[PDB]
Amino acid sequence: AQKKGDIILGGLFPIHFGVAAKDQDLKSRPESVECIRYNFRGFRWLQAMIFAIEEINSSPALLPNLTLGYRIFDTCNTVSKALEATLSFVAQNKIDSLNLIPSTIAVVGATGSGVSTAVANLLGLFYIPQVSYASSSRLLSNKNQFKSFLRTIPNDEHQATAMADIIEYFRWNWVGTIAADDDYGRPGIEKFREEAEERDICIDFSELISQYSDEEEIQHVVEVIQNSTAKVIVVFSSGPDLEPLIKEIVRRNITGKIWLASEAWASSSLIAMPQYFHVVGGTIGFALKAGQIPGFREFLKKVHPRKSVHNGFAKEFWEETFNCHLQESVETPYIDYTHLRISYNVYLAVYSIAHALQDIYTCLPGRGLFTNGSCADIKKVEAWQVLKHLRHLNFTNNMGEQVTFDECGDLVGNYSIINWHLSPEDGSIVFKEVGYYNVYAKKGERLFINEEKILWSGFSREVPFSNCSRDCLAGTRKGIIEGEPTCCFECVECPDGEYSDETDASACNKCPDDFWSNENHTSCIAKEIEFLSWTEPFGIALTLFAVLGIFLTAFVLGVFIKFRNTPIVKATNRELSYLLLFSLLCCFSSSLFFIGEPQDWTCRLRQPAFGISFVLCISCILVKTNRVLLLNLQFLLVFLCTFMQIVICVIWLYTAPPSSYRNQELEDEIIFITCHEGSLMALGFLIGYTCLLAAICFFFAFKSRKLPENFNEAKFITFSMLIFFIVWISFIPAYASTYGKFVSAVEVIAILAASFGLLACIFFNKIYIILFKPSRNTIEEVRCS
Amino acid sequence: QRAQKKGDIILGGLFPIHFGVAAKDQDLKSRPESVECIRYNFRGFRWLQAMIFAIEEINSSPALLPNLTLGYRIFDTCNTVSKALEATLSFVAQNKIPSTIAVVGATGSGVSTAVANLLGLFYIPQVSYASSSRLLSNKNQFKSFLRTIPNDEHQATAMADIIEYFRWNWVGTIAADDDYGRPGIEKFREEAEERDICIDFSELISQYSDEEEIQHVVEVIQNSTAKVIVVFSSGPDLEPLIKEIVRRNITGKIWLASEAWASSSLIAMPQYFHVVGGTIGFALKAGQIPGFREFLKKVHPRKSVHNGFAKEFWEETFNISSVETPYIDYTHLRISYNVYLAVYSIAHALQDIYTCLPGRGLFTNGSCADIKKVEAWQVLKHLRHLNFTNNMGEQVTFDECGDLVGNYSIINWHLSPEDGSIVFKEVGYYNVYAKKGERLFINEEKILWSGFSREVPFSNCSRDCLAGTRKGIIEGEPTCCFECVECPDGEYSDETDASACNKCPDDFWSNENHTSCIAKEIEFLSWTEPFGIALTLFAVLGIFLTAFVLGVFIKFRNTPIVKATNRELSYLLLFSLLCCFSSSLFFIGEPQDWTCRLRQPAFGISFVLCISCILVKTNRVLLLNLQFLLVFLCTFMQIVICVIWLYTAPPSSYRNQELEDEIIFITCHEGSLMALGFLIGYTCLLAAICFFFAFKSRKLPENFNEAKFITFSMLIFFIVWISFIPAYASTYGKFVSAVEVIAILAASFGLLACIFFNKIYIILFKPSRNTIEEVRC
Numbered sequence A: 001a002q003k004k005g006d007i008i009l010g011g012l013f014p015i016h017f018g019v020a021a022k023d024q025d026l027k028s029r030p031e032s033v034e035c036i037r038y039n040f041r042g043f044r045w046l047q048a049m050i051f052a053i054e055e056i057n058s059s060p061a062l063l064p065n066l067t068l069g070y071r072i073f074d075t076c077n078t079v080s081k082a083l084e085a086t087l088s089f090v091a092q093n094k095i096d097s098l099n100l101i102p103s104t105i106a107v108v109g110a111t112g113s114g115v116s117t118a119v120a121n122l123l124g125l126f127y128i129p130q131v132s133y134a135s136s137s138r139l140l141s142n143k144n145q146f147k148s149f150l151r152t153i154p155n156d157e158h159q160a161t162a163m164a165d166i167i168e169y170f171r172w173n174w175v176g177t178i179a180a181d182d183d184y185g186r187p188g189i190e191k192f193r194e195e196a197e198e199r200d201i202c203i204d205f206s207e208l209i210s211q212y213s214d215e216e217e218i219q220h221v222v223e224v225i226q227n228s229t230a231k232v233i234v235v236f237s238s239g240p241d242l243e244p245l246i247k248e249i250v251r252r253n254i255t256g257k258i259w260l261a262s263e264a265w266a267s268s269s270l271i272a273m274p275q276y277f278h279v280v281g282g283t284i285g286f287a288l289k290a291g292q293i294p295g296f297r298e299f300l301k302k303v304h305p306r307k308s309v310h311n312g313f314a315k316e317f318w319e320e321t322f323n324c325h326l327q328e329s330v331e332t333p334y335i336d337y338t339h340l341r342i343s344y345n346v347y348l349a350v351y352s353i354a355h356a357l358q359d360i361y362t363c364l365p366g367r368g369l370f371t372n373g374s375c376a377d378i379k380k381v382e383a384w385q386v387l388k389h390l391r392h393l394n395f396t397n398n399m400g401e402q403v404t405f406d407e408c409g410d411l412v413g414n415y416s417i418i419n420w421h422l423s424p425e426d427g428s429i430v431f432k433e434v435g436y437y438n439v440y441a442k443k444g445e446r447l448f449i450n451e452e453k454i455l456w457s458g459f460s461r462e463v464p465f466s467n468c469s470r471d472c473l474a475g476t477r478k479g480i481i482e483g484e485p486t487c488c489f490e491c492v493e494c495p496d497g498e499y500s501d502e503t504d505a506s507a508c509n510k511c512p513d514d515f516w517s518n519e520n521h522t523s524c525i526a527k528e529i530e531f532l533s534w535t536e537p538f539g540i541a542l543t544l545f546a547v548l549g550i551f552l553t554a555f556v557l558g559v560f561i562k563f564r565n566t567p568i569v570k571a572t573n574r575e576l577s578y579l580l581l582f583s584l585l586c587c588f589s590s591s592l593f594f595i596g597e598p599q600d601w602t603c604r605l606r607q608p609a610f611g612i613s614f615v616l617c618i619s620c621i622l623v624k625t626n627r628v629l630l631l632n633l634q635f636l637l638v639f640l641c642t643f644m645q646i647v648i649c650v651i652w653l654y655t656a657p658p659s660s661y662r663n664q665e666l667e668d669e670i671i672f673i674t675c676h677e678g679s680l681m682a683l684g685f686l687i688g689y690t691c692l693l694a695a696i697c698f699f700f701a702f703k704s705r706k707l708p709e710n711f712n713e714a715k716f717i718t719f720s721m722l723i724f725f726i727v728w729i730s731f732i733p734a735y736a737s738t739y740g741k742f743v744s745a746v747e748v749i750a751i752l753a754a755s756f757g758l759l760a761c762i763f764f765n766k767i768y769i770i771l772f773k774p775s776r777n778t779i780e781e782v783r784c785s
Numbered sequence B: 001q002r003a004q005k006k007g008d009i010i011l012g013g014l015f016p017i018h019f020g021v022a023a024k025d026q027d028l029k030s031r032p033e034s035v036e037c038i039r040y041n042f043r044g045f046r047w048l049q050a051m052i053f054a055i056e057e058i059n060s061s062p063a064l065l066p067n068l069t070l071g072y073r074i075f076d077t078c079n080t081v082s083k084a085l086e087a088t089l090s091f092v093a094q095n096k097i098p099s100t101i102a103v104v105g106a107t108g109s110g111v112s113t114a115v116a117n118l119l120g121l122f123y124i125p126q127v128s129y130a131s132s133s134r135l136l137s138n139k140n141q142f143k144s145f146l147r148t149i150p151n152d153e154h155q156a157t158a159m160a161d162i163i164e165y166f167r168w169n170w171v172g173t174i175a176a177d178d179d180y181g182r183p184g185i186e187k188f189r190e191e192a193e194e195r196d197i198c199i200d201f202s203e204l205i206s207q208y209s210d211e212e213e214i215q216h217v218v219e220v221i222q223n224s225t226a227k228v229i230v231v232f233s234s235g236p237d238l239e240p241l242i243k244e245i246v247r248r249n250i251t252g253k254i255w256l257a258s259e260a261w262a263s264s265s266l267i268a269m270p271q272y273f274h275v276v277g278g279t280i281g282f283a284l285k286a287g288q289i290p291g292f293r294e295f296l297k298k299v300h301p302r303k304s305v306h307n308g309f310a311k312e313f314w315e316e317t318f319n320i321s322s323v324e325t326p327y328i329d330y331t332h333l334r335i336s337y338n339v340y341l342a343v344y345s346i347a348h349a350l351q352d353i354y355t356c357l358p359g360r361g362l363f364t365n366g367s368c369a370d371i372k373k374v375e376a377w378q379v380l381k382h383l384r385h386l387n388f389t390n391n392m393g394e395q396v397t398f399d400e401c402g403d404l405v406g407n408y409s410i411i412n413w414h415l416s417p418e419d420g421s422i423v424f425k426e427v428g429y430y431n432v433y434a435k436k437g438e439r440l441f442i443n444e445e446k447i448l449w450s451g452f453s454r455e456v457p458f459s460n461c462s463r464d465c466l467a468g469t470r471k472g473i474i475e476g477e478p479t480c481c482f483e484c485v486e487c488p489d490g491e492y493s494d495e496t497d498a499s500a501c502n503k504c505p506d507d508f509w510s511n512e513n514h515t516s517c518i519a520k521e522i523e524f525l526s527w528t529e530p531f532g533i534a535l536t537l538f539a540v541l542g543i544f545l546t547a548f549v550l551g552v553f554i555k556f557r558n559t560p561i562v563k564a565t566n567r568e569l570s571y572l573l574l575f576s577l578l579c580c581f582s583s584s585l586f587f588i589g590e591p592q593d594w595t596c597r598l599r600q601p602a603f604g605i606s607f608v609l610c611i612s613c614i615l616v617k618t619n620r621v622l623l624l625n626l627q628f629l630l631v632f633l634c635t636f637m638q639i640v641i642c643v644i645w646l647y648t649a650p651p652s653s654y655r656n657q658e659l660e661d662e663i664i665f666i667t668c669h670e671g672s673l674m675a676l677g678f679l680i681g682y683t684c685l686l687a688a689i690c691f692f693f694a695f696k697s698r699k700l701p702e703n704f705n706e707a708k709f710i711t712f713s714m715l716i717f718f719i720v721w722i723s724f725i726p727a728y729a730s731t732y733g734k735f736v737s738a739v740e741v742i743a744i745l746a747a748s749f750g751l752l753a754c755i756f757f758n759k760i761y762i763i764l765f766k767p768s769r770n771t772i773e774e775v776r777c
């Protein structure tokens, strides 16, 4: 393809897919290689270039009086078919200076990354610029290795640093990764694995896909996708690289996932067929921004081979389009496009070169853009002047937006984010635009998404739930790591020690003493303070039993005091019964210390009242016999016997008093307000001295059991000693068996039992002789001995 | 400039005369100019002089290429792609629309894959001499590439097998950014997985790296503990981080080299020795070029017409060839022999073209080419079919892909005391002819580690740990890194390394040492234990005195001491004494099933019969007929209890390992505790019954105050019964059974203290006739 002009532009296009791979034996002269598979889509691209050139030469508003001509060759998407053309561009630029008439001014560049990489090395010698329409490899973006390379497609790596941001507008963690087994899939997954760990995103699985892979490895990948519990899968792959794979996943029929798409396959019709009716439906993809061209659907239609000479490929496109032959409107992916996404790139690149030449044509002679303010002339233009202007480009394409090439050479633009909503008239995979992204601006304003229009899971509406672990409910903590990566966690129930209220907490928290948890680790309610309480009816029942004995003792005092020097009273010593009656009068009241909540002073002196009361009671009844008794020596002996325990009580209360302790060691819910005894021997001495005195009076009472004197008093004294040792021996098993808030109850019942036991035996019969109907025969002063 | 001489057939050439180019950012405000090259290289000039010498020799030898003269055209490469492409255009220019026949070139490897693409279109052959990358091996992408240096796919496997010969685990790597480094290090990372080694850190350096990148690389190499760092890179690329590391005085690392920088005077300097010393690297095979030292000293910049790189060279060496430089200081010829060999390879190609008779056919239908009009596509056909006997005497032929196989040599650096130049003494050969696994060989006493270290260094991630402990715990790390934790008691390890400790045998508990475990001890009072022989002696003495009292009762009979009481009823007390004395022996020894079965009943029946003998002895409230039945009924009311539990719940022997781990304890089981409390209560009740009558009849003086003595006997019995309970509650094993029998022994003597003792005092002493008097009592 070649038409003359004042300024000549080069061009490379992939009209044929691939070459015929013969094995040269080189027995004869080598021959030129053949190309085999015809590309219709590449022919649509070349028609876009011829349309752009005819538009610029038809208008006078841009580049007047300068007819532009093209020279276009067919790369067969191989390097060897490309450099043979590049040696035809490069020649008349500087061949007379290399070796001891049109000149190419720019090249509209090559599709595959390897082809452009090979061509740009040769074109970097002579500083002839090159704008590309499809090359998206990262390594081309070096200004150091390649001097002159410009792109009208943005860099692929930005897709990866776009892609993580979509996740962080929806707040997910768990994700899976599929990459193509190619040169395109590995930079994308490497950069994504960088940015994910940078943004704390954990990836479940990494897999590879190819046309060359076996069906068994595809089955392994199918098992990996079905087994793993991840709701999003990133795919960096080319269009043909999925054609078996999505078909065999449709064989499995999984319909839960929502997919994420790279730029190559997001708009690929080879990755979306209506057989893939709903199972792929709901995904999100990075398309390329498409804008209409007027006239181009009439310019494609108006081609015919023997009518237009300058397009050399028409003579073969006629013959292989519909299968005809020649002597020198139908179903094809030539006419049947529905989005212009690369054809628009070719049209835009040809206008890029057009406005660069315009800025050379109209710069004022005063302030140029070169050394010492001089413009370059237009009828003697060289390549380096055009390159210098072409970095500084800022103009309005007819769509409306600005275009300015970046410092690295990329074109600043907006990736479009699409969703696939099944059009109810169409019933096929139909794309719908939802969100848009900006690579050039700072982070935080790159990505806006309106979420009301996107539909995950086909007809579903709600955001999927794809963390590694479902977050733990209230009453638990975030738990320890389980050997999975750090985004994962387990759920652990809180102990009964502490509570958990705020959701997804790391550790539980405590609370005060006398506040222990309820169940579920809700919070810390109050504990139970368990004391033998007057609010309970059992305590006031015990108090009534205590008061009744005091009243009966007072009656005994009344009948004692009224009858003096009377024949029942006069025999036994008159002060003796008076001293005996006060012993009962205080021993009855002494039981009241063991009821209610223990205060410390009442906890302190409770045992000495017991000790003093029973010591003087047992002493005064032991000195009452008058057989082994004879100033009142009985009174002095009682004083000595009482003071010999009073010394024990004063010493024990001055060296180590008992303490009042809230023993919480018994149970968490119920605390026990009790008393620590202090010195154990101090309580043991007061326990034993009373027992020894009781044994002594028991021995002196039993030795005169039969002898009558004042109505068998020795027998009743023996009975009193018997009931005393009986209740004292019945307290200790009861003491061991009894649980708290009843050991005080067992104590006061035992004291009450001993109290009426020592009350009744001594005095009831004498009360009967003073009170029953034969009292007159009971008391005779000579008699009744 | 360039080198040129006219001839009938011309050859190309590319040689890296300058190391690198000035990195000038281009303004593009003016004419873009041609960049200059930075720092001059002498070694490249020696290589170029080797090629000019080979061409002069071929031109002057009349047996090879007769009567036709070969010329040459050389351009320098400056080790960058741009100057190379500008040169290959000037080769290729005429053929598209004098013609170069071959190109002996592409010293670098990045340059190689561009010059091959641009020469592959026209089918001009290309013979490399130093490019060793593997991507250029295939003959589908590159039609006409041929190497005379071996491929590096052997080198990665050699760098793997050196680890297995020196037994290492932890190693880290860095590579060059070009096609020389990264494919080879991918190959070695592939071959590393089989050998079960661990790769810690991989980093990448290019020659034009900034200060921040080499700062980061020094940080990574400083942090990890790997001694062995493998570097698969060129000469000038590694130079910046060498500047940085020797500025920081890092001293511990051991380096393991590639082919390219293993012998380079750019790095091997006296000033860098305290880092890069002692390293190990591959050097290629030697060669012999005669007549070449003289031809090196025959350069003269006025007389040097045809060469054009002479004059610049003079301005680098003197600003009369005895000045220290790497142009004439070469120990061996390693790469210059390859360039000489490549020029003879093309020479024999054209010689065979000159000698094909018509019948031999290598073109079309058996037709031969012609020398007058020779094309670059025919020389490729003779290049694929080549053999000649080179001047040494081996045979040269190319493989299908293009490489030439050869053995390498591994060398280890040193420091000679003469002038401190780092001297390259060899250690080993790597013969690639033989099978995989019988190639490498390292003589050890010559190889000398960095800092003249005799010992082989340690380079494992984890210390393989002691025989006491065990190692099997991997916390997500690579498997070479592992941890050692002390296995629990009951389990010990008896081998140098294992995943887990085996359980110690039973009747043994694991030692503190954890190397081996020794057996426990059963703790029990024993018959051969002399402390127990004391108790056995007491038992024997008590039995002997019981026999003494019985014999006194036998022979001193008819006496009023004896004849007042019931003469049979005395014998029951003696047999009771013998029985209760004999019953104490069942607690001495290791308890068995029979002993644990019958320990209690013998004591029960013996003591019951003993008390039953003295219940009805007193005949104050008691009077063959009556007393025999009185004993018999209370004997029955204990033997029924005994047979009841000995048929219901026999207590048995029990070995408790519960109390102490290092010493087990053997004791009889409790065995129906009610069926022992019942016997104890029965005994105490029968004791209280006689104690009541003894307290009642205390004052009555009869038969030497018999009732009073009975009261003291019962008092002594209750005294030792009270004394038993804290002694039971206090003592531990091997003592609670000792006190038990001891208590029984005490009680036994108490009976013989009171019952038949003081009466014997009348009978043996002076009161014998007084005791033998029927009037008495």
Ligand SMILES: CC(C)(Cc1ccc2ccccc2c1)NC[C@@H](O)COc1cccc(Cl)c1C#N
Pocket (backbone or CB within 6 Å): A610, A687, A724, A727, A728, A731, A732, A735, A747, A750, A751, A754
């Ligand atoms: C009042 C008392 C001393 C026990 C008490 C109770 C009732 C009685 C009725 C009649 C006559 C004496 C009585 C003595 N409070 C002490 C108690 O806390 C502790 O109890 C004990 C605890 C351990 C050991 C012993 Cl040995 C005792 C007693 N004893």
Ligand SMILES: CC(C)(Cc1ccc2ccccc2c1)NC[C@@H](O)COc1cccc(Cl)c1C#N
Pocket (backbone or CB within 6 Å): B603, B680, B720, B721, B724, B728, B740, B743, B744, B747
């Ligand atoms: C032999 C004996 C039955 C205890 C014994 C020891 C010496 C004695 C000396 C004179 C007369 C009787 C004696 C009884 N071995 C069993 C012992 O382990 C168990 O002991 C007890 C265990 C719990 C409660 C009691 Cl109340 C006892 C007794 N008792």
Ligand SMILES: *[C@@H]1O[C@H](CO)[C@@H](O[C@@H]2O[C@H](CO)[C@@H](O)[C@H](O)[C@H]2NC(C)=O)[C@H](O)[C@H]1NC(C)=O
Pocket (backbone or CB within 6 Å): B166, B167, B168, B169, B196, B460, B461, B462, B464, B480
């Ligand atoms: C750690 O060092 C030891 C010895 O220094 C090596 O490990 C084993 O050593 C024995 C002894 O010859 C060999 O039989 C084994 O084959 C070695 N195992 C491995 C995996 O090499 C080796 O140098 C290092 N081993 C590890 C696991 O790091």
Ligand SMILES: *[C@@H]1O[C@H](CO)[C@@H](O)[C@H](O)[C@H]1NC(C)=O
Pocket (backbone or CB within 6 Å): A413, A414, A436, A437, A438, A441
């Ligand atoms: C394209 O990106 C620019 C840069 O911020 C923005 O101003 C513009 O609105 C975007 N347009 C579309 C259609 O996305």
Ligand SMILES: *[C@@H]1O[C@H](CO)[C@@H](O)[C@H](O)[C@H]1NC(C)=O
Pocket (backbone or CB within 6 Å): A171, A172, A173, A464, A465, A466, A467, A470, A471
């Ligand atoms: C997923 O985890 C994020 C934290 O990274 C959290 O904010 C979000 O609520 C979680 N989504 C769930 C559990 O659905």
Ligand SMILES: *[C@@H]1O[C@H](CO)[C@@H](O)[C@H](O)[C@H]1NC(C)=O
Pocket (backbone or CB within 6 Å): B219, B220, B223
């Ligand atoms: C590792 O390297 C970093 C910088 O590369 C440094 O800050 C750090 O101290 C080093 N050591 C450790 C143990 O992290």
Ligand SMILES: *[C@@H]1O[C@H](CO)[C@@H](O)[C@H](O)[C@H]1NC(C)=O
Pocket (backbone or CB within 6 Å): B386, B387, B388, B395, B396, B397
């Ligand atoms: C070269 O010649 C010798 C001579 O017989 C032969 O042994 C050798 O194999 C030949 N090399 C080939 C055919 O590659």
Ligand SMILES: *[C@@H]1O[C@H](CO)[C@@H](O)[C@H](O)[C@H]1NC(C)=O
Pocket (backbone or CB within 6 Å): B405, B406, B407, B429, B430, B431, B432, B433, B434
């Ligand atoms: C390499 O070294 C071995 C060692 O003897 C030698 O026999 C062999 O010839 C050498 N060359 C090759 C190509 O193996």
